Amino acid sequence: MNFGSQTPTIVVLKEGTDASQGKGQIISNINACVAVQEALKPTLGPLGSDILIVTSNQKTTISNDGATILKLLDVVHPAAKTLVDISRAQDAEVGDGTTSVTILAGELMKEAKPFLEEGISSHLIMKGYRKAVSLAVEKINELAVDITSEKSSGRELLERCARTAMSSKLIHNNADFFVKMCVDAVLSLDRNDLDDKLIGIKKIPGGAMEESLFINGVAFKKTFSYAGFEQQPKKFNNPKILSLNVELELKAEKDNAEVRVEHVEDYQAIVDAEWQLIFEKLRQVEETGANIVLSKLPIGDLATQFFADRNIFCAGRVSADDMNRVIQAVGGSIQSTTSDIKPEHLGTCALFEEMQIGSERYNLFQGCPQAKTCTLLLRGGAEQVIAEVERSLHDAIMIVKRALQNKLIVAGGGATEMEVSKCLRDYSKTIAGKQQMIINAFAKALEVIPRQLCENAGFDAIEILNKLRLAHSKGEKWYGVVFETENIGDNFAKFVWEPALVKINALNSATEATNLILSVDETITNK
Amino acid sequence: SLQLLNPKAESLRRDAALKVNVTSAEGLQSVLETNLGPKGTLKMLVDGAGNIKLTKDGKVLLTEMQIQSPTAVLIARAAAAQDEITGDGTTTVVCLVGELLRQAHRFIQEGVHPRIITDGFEIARKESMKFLDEFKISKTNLSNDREFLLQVARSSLLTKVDADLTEVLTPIVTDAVLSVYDAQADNLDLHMVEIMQMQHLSPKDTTFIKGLVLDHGGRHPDMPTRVKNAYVLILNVSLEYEKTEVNSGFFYSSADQRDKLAASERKFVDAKLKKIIDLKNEVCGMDPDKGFVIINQKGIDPMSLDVFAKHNILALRRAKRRNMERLQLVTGGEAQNSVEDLSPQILGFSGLVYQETIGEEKFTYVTENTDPKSCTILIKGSTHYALAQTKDAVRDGLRAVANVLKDKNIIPGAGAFYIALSRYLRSANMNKLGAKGKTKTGIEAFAEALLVIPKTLVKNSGFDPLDVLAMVEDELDDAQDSDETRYVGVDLNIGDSCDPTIEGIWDSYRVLRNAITGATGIASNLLLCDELLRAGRS
Amino acid sequence: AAAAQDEITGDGTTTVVCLVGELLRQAHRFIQEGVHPRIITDGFEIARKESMKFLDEFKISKTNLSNDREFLLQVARS
Amino acid sequence: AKQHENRLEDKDLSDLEELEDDEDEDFLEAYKIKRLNEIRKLQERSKFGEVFHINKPEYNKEVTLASQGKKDDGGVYVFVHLSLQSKLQSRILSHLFQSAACKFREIKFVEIPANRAIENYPESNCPTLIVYYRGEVIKNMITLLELGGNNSKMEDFEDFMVKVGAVAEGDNRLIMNRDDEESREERKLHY
Amino acid sequence: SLRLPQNPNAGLFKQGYNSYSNADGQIIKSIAAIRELHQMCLTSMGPCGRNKIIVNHLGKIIITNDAATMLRELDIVHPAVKVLVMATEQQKIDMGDGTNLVMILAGELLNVSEKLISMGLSAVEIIQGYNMARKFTLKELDEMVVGEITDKNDKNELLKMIKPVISSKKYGSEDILSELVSEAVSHVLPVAQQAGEIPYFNVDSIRVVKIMGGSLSNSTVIKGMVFNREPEGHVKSLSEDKKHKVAVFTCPLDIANTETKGTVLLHNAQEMLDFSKGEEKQIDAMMKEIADMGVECIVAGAGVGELALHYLNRYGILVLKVPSKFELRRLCRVCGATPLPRLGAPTPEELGLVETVKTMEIGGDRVTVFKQEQGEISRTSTIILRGATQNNLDDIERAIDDGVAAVKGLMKPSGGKLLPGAGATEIELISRITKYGERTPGLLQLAIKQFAVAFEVVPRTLAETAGLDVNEVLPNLYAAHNVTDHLYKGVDIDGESDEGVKDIREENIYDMLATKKFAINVATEAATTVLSIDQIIMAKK
Numbered sequence A: 001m002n003f004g005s006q007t008p009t010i011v012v013l014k015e016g017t018d019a020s021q022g023k024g025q026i027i028s029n030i031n032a033c034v035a036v037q038e039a040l041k042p043t044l045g046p047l048g049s050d051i052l053i054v055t056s057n058q059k060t061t062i063s064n065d066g067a068t069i070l071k072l073l074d075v076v077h078p079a080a081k082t083l084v085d086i087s088r089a090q091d092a093e094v095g096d097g098t099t100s101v102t103i104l105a106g107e108l109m110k111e112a113k114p115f116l117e118e119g120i121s122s123h124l125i126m127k128g129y130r131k132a133v134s135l136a137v138e139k140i141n142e143l144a145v146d147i148t149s150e151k152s153s154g155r156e157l158l159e160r161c162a163r164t165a166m167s168s169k170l171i172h173n174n175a176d177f178f179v180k181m182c183v184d185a186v187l188s189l190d191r192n193d194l195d196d197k198l199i200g201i202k203k204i205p206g207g208a209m210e211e212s213l214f215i216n217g218v219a220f221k222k223t224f225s226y227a228g229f230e231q232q233p234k235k236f237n238n239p240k241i242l243s244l245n246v247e248l249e250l251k252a253e254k255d256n257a258e259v260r261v262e263h264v265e266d267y268q269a270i271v272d273a274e275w276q277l278i279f280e281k282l283r284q285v286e287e288t289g290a291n292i293v294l295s296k297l298p299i300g301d302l303a304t305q306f307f308a309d310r311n312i313f314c315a316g317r318v319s320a321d322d323m324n325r326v327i328q329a330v331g332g333s334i335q336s337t338t339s340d341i342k343p344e345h346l347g348t349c350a351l352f353e354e355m356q357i358g359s360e361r362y363n364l365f366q367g368c369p370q371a372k373t374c375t376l377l378l379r380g381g382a383e384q385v386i387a388e389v390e391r392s393l394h395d396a397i398m399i400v401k402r403a404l405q406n407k408l409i410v411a412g413g414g415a416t417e418m419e420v421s422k423c424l425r426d427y428s429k430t431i432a433g434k435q436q437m438i439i440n441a442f443a444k445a446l447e448v449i450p451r452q453l454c455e456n457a458g459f460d461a462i463e464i465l466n467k468l469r470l471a472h473s474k475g476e477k478w479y480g481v482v483f484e485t486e487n488i489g490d491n492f493a494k495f496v497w498e499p500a501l502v503k504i505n506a507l508n509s510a511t512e513a514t515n516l517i518l519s520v521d522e523t524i525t526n527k
Numbered sequence B: 001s002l003q004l005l006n007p008k009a010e011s012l013r014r015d016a017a018l019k020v021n022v023t024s025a026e027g028l029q030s031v032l033e034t035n036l037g038p039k040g041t042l043k044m045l046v047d048g049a050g051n052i053k054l055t056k057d058g059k060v061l062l063t064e065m066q067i068q069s070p071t072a073v074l075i076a077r078a079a080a081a082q083d084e085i086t087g088d089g090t091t092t093v094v095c096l097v098g099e100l101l102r103q104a105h106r107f108i109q110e111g112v113h114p115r116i117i118t119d120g121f122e123i124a125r126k127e128s129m130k131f132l133d134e135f136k137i138s139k140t141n142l143s144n145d146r147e148f149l150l151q152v153a154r155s156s157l158l159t160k161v162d163a164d165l166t167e168v169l170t171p172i173v174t175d176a177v178l179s180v181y182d183a184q185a186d187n188l189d190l191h192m193v194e195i196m197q198m199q200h201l202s203p204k205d206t207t208f209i210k211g212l213v214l215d216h217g218g219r220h221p222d223m224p225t226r227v228k229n230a231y232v233l234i235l236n237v238s239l240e241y242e243k244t245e246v247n248s249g250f251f252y253s254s255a256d257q258r259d260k261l262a263a264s265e266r267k268f269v270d271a272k273l274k275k276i277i278d279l280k281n282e283v284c285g286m287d288p289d290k291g292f293v294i295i296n297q298k299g300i301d302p303m304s305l306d307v308f309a310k311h312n313i314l315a316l317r318r319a320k321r322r323n324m325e326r327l328q329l330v331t332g333g334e335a336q337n338s339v340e341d342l343s344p345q346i347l348g349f350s351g352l353v354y355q356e357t358i359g360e361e362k363f364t365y366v367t368e369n370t371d372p373k374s375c376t377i378l379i380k381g382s383t384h385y386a387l388a389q390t391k392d393a394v395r396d397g398l399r400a401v402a403n404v405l406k407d408k409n410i411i412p413g414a415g416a417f418y419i420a421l422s423r424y425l426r427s428a429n430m431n432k433l434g435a436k437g438k439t440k441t442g443i444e445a446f447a448e449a450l451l452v453i454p455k456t457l458v459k460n461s462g463f464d465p466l467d468v469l470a471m472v473e474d475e476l477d478d479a480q481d482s483d484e485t486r487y488v489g490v491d492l493n494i495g496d497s498c499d500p501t502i503e504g505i506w507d508s509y510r511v512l513r514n515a516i517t518g519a520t521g522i523a524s525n526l527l528l529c530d531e532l533l534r535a536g537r538s
Numbered sequence C: 001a002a003a004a005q006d007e008i009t010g011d012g013t014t015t016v017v018c019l020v021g022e023l024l025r026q027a028h029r030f031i032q033e034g035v036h037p038r039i040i041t042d043g044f045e046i047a048r049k050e051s052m053k054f055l056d057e058f059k060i061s062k063t064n065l066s067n068d069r070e071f072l073l074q075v076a077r078s
Numbered sequence D: 001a002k003q004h005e006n007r008l009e010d011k012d013l014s015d016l017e018e019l020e021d022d023e024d025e026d027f028l029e030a031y032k033i034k035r036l037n038e039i040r041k042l043q044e045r046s047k048f049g050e051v052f053h054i055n056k057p058e059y060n061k062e063v064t065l066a067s068q069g070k071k072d073d074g075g076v077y078v079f080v081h082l083s084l085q086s087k088l089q090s091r092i093l094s095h096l097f098q099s100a101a102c103k104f105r106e107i108k109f110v111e112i113p114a115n116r117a118i119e120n121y122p123e124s125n126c127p128t129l130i131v132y133y134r135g136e137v138i139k140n141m142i143t144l145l146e147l148g149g150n151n152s153k154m155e156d157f158e159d160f161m162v163k164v165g166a167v168a169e170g171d172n173r174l175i176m177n178r179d180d181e182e183s184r185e186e187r188k189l190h191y
Numbered sequence E: 001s002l003r004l005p006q007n008p009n010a011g012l013f014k015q016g017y018n019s020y021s022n023a024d025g026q027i028i029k030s031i032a033a034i035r036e037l038h039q040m041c042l043t044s045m046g047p048c049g050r051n052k053i054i055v056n057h058l059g060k061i062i063i064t065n066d067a068a069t070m071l072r073e074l075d076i077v078h079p080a081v082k083v084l085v086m087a088t089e090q091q092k093i094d095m096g097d098g099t100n101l102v103m104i105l106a107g108e109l110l111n112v113s114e115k116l117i118s119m120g121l122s123a124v125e126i127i128q129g130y131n132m133a134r135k136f137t138l139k140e141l142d143e144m145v146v147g148e149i150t151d152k153n154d155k156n157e158l159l160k161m162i163k164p165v166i167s168s169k170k171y172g173s174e175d176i177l178s179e180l181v182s183e184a185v186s187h188v189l190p191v192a193q194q195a196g197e198i199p200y201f202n203v204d205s206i207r208v209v210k211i212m213g214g215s216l217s218n219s220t221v222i223k224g225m226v227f228n229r230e231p232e233g234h235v236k237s238l239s240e241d242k243k244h245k246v247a248v249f250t251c252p253l254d255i256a257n258t259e260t261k262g263t264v265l266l267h268n269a270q271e272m273l274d275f276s277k278g279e280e281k282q283i284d285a286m287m288k289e290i291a292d293m294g295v296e297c298i299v300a301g302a303g304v305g306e307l308a309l310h311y312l313n314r315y316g317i318l319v320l321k322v323p324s325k326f327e328l329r330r331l332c333r334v335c336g337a338t339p340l341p342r343l344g345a346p347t348p349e350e351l352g353l354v355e356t357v358k359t360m361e362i363g364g365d366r367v368t369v370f371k372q373e374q375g376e377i378s379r380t381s382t383i384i385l386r387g388a389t390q391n392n393l394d395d396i397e398r399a400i401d402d403g404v405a406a407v408k409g410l411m412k413p414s415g416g417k418l419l420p421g422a423g424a425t426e427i428e429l430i431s432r433i434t435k436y437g438e439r440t441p442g443l444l445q446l447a448i449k450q451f452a453v454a455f456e457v458v459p460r461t462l463a464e465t466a467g468l469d470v471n472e473v474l475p476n477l478y479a480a481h482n483v484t485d486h487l488y489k490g491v492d493i494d495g496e497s498d499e500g501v502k503d504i505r506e507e508n509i510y511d512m513l514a515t516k517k518f519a520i521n522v523a524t525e526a527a528t529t530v531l532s533i534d535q536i537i538m539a540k541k
Ligand SMILES: Nc1ncnc2c1ncn2[C@@H]1O[C@H](COP(=O)(O)OP(=O)(O)O)[C@@H](O)[C@H]1O
Pocket: A043, A044, A045, A046, A064, A065, A095, A096, A097, A098, A099, A100, A164, A165, A166, A167, A168, A169, A412, A413, A414, A449, A481, A482, A483, A496
């Protein structure tokens, strides 16, 4: 009846598919997040340390924020990918607190360890944190004071909040000069339409970072330059900027036109018609007096010798993102027809000068007060100093990006976490149930942000935190820790502020990161 | 159930275990089907060593070819165990278990239970035991009919060897068996009858010797070869040197004392030789006409052989345990171990003692006894397989004829026993029996399985097996009404029936009894088994 | 054989393999008894032709012109 | 296993119609729609079909840009010929380019004089055959002694195009696979 | 007695084929082996269920506590499990609700029938038993209905419909996600005094646009849609025109070229001079007609050329690619226009209306928002999800797909009436079937009783996930049904659940009639197949 000697049993899952039951896997998932958490533990704070990562392709990448550190390390574990997703989400939405949101997410998982060791299943502890966030977000809104009541100046607001962003970086001593760059850069943008692509920074080598300069114009980097370059004047007084999407090339990318002729006299006409058409396009541009011609697609060789004669500047092979930044500065839009041009579409600038830095040449527009864009030429010693300072000012721009939309001041230095925690402790004592110990653990998890500020500074943490617990018994606000005077005090007197969106999205993202892998008990991996 | 327990195993159950026992049975049956009968085919067995051994015995085929199947090893032990005590009926057990399984398996496919089928074989077996009492015939041994023993000897010898070897080797067995019967009527096969190998002129020159033949002779040339009247002496004492239980050095001091102590080696031997000389002085009369021979079970020192050679005493050393237990039966003397107490009564008698040698070996012949109580069968042969073929033929022939003298009955063969049980089981009233229910086919299955044996004899002759039973069936239909008790047979020469009473074909009593009993037990146990498996530590 | 049965007819494949298995079983029972395969197959053909002379008498004729639904349902149900 | 695959793999859109009466429609028409789509892709890729007698300024575009094609990595093979009219092998290779151009319309066939190609090129090394693909030189071939020399044939040139990955092995246009109609006629009669 | 004879049917079917018939023990091998995956769907059941992370061979990680999404990716070698796999997929594609009951009720019927097969009851009788029990179950569910709804238009009435469905998946978010789904359905349904005759509804009406970052409370409803796309050419006016006519062209805006390939042929140089202006005047004749009627937005599916984009920039016409064909027709439903592969000219009847189009960043990426106010819409809506992780937003999408699939399950048939949930009607069916088994004497009565015992897992699985003792609240719940008030008894999930009694109407937990009928039928048909098979034949790899 049977087909053969024996019949081995079937494994239900595929051969090699890992699976496990019980409380061991969720503890392993929590320990996996804590293992990723320990890498970013000493990074938190102004006195924190950077992290050096080298991937398989052997490209050095130094960073301080946890957004790109987790992007470099390709994470296999799904539970450890939760910290990476919120870090990119925090980087995409706000742009600040990418390290603290991962530390708070792991600390809630760390404080959930002994409750999971108890018989309480994960559906109780999820309800406690989810109930606590509903009061924490409201308490941050109640502690948010408005700036217009004092009738202060608007220029000093951006400088005050951007000073906090330049901590824990290479800039904190040179922040007196570079904070004016990003504040004046973002103010040139339109308040209604604030764009993230108009703040592109070129990774130009050479030079010290303090030698940079902020200009309302935009640069592009010299392009291919067929013979013709270094004959035109590289300095103009009031040049007219022109942009053309049409490809000025003698049938380079055009489709192959099958020309068929049957006469010798017409062969002289058809070969001169190529010269006749291309010169008609040059003469039409010549009549308008366009002193600076630009194009995304390449410029022909004959045009360079023609524009070199009448001191007309030309450049091609510009990218779409860089060319879009030019149009926001120089006014009129792009036209791809030489006959449909108009004087009114041309731009203008009060000064123009080409100067070399780092053995590279960059054309710089100058004197453009009507420009709704900006540029930054960060120069730096190595290549990672440029990239680190690049993403640092991108985070500084991200603070003033969101500060203009909504103007809310909140405490800093770990103070906002403690006023929220002690309020939840006052709310927890009236519960008298299982949710009391959970909310007290949520209050203990918010205390961790003051810890790493003190651990990286070298001072003992248990003594100073007990001093704050004695200080927060009475009514007090903007009470945290500082490092200059080596003694705690009023942060408002010390003049340090932050936005409220950083703390709100951090608590929601950290609790959502916690509830994702506390609402599971198994991780199956095929293959 | 076995795969999750054992990570590696094999399991057959409920259809393959039944097919295995039947397929292995039909496979092993086809091997020994052609050998059964007088016109069967011979079968040689050559291993990797290259030696050759030829015989038709199923035991030699089974106990020399290694077998892997779990069913056949039980058929091997069953075929071997039945033959090891009885000496006949080896292939008959294989054919019964080889046929009874396939004949019952057709009804297992129909859906009959194995338990009630084997219940029918057991109650049918009891009917055959009751039928053996009526089927057998009484024979009185006081007549001492030598022609009756000749016909029994040709039954087994014609099956193994041809008529040329049967006619010359038949009276060799009859003369050996004629001396077995005595007043005490105690049968003795292993001690009395023996077989010895000897490469000589041909197998046809096998002769019967009434006395005990020995495979050794006189070492020295001067010792006598032929002796007319030799009085034997049995001594189990060892007359060479003995190392003496921890005894160590003959600490000699001077050179003269060295050889003086070396001469004491002879004193222990000469103390025993003097008792033989004192015994020879009593029987010293007619010394040239008469003689004396000494047979020792252990070795004799070569220094002492010259003592026997001077007195013309024949010396034979290193005899077997069995030969010392046979000299009293042949020569009529008595055995002795120690040399202290001797007498002339223990000495035997022999009428002729001579030696003949070929190549390097030498044989001693003893014969012409006054009243020999035992004898030997010295078989001649050409090749080693010729001796092995004569070994199995004489081993199976002596056991078959010896069992006739044990009891007072004998069973005629040639299919008379199987054909008689067929009509008995198929015509007997079932109300007399205690079996009911689905035992209808169990009687028919075992009754029909017995018919395949006598036609297997026909399958070797080439005739049609179903047609040569037509007149056999018609004979028994009229024999019951004709008022004449006769038993039919199966003659393969002409392809017609015969009478084993006048032709001389016979079979022993305990062969067919133990065969069906051993076959029914093995076949029943194989049917009830419904699962095969292998498991263990290795 | 089951393919040619299912091709032209579309039913009765299980009867073909059982008849061939049983015919070889019942035939091999007699081949072991010393009978040649030739006369065994000769009897099957005479038995086959005898069944056609039994089948044509065993069948029954019905009138399908009425197109009754009860007969087609029970025939389809079988 | 291959007997089932030969019904579809070893038959073009013209040969697949042979199995319309024998094989199932859904089995056949499912593959004919697949092969019909492949034929449409080759028609869109047929941007060439005659030898492009170019000059140098243009080389920097025709030879190399083309090699990038769409840059969907739509690469395009570009066979260059540094012609030299004094050599006998050059005129032979020019005939092979025009013959292959009429067949393989997707592959670009480029020709230019060798004296105008490289400054002071060795005349002994001419004729030269270069094969560009995605801007990279796949093969820098030397004079045609490898391809038989003076006795070079069209069959040898088509075999070289298969080695560099320009044409598939089982392409119906290759003379090795494009059996004559009289050849297939004898096979059907003797089958 | 060392090597076996090796099963002499080995001349038959190859070694790769494995037979696992009965008598040998197939049923015992199967019902058991599948208990591992039965616990997977059992642990993921209820509002407190645990989601399961499934990493496929490609590496796309998913985390979903359903059953259809999990078993689709699990490569399962066991054939008897696969009967339960695609049987659950039938519930997903047809009704979109009840995947879990099916995987649980179908497996429990095999688990509870261990007593019937082990006692020695015939397998053929068990199939006849569950079939007759299935018929009695379908007839009896109609009598226990108390939620006969006839309005099915207003938003507050859907609180008894959508919120029980959303309360199962991620119980913590009820009011927020129910507001998004309920407000989406109100935008989908048209404004009318009496809409009848089975109005059309489809799952493709409500789409889900996933945006990275942002708390779940900050989400909002959009009547149009949102694409991750870069606008080109200009900035919008956003209040000046007050309304915009949007033309959707299947073919691109370019000179009409044929399918067969052509090229440019010029016999003389006179045509060479006019060819540069001929292409400009050709499109100008076709582009000027579009601007006369005031089409302030054009959507071309294929790639738009630069010559066509240049003429549109000066007039201030919005352009958009929309390469995929499925999402191209959904934009037409918003404006209320038809596709036009012909260029032609814009007509007033075929052109729709759109209020405004504005561009911003929601999660850092620039997107195009087609939100309109005071306009007429028909079967179109979107829900902008804000979340911390992409892994969590994937589960919100399927939860919304199951929510709107229930709307398809209501409006497509004539009645999608409610039933008491939270372990209320399941225990009632145990009492009905217990009384039904005594009415019909016969050997099949044992099958009728064991069919009722399989419904026990529904109440206790909510208690097991709640960390409660099954032997206390489950027998205490039977005492509450002794005797309307006894019908609305259910399983409580709270710290005060020691009593084990909570009224259903306080929170309005309800289930669908058609969902449970289709689930019980597919569950019985799944168990019918597994109990009917006896031999399972495998193959190599
Ligand atoms: N001037 C300051 N005084 C006190 N605390 C500060 C100051 N600047 C930054 N911090 C604290 O340092 C912590 C880490 O900031 P940092 O790591 O620089 O930003 P991010 O984590 O976004 O990269 C913040 O939680 C903040 O409270």
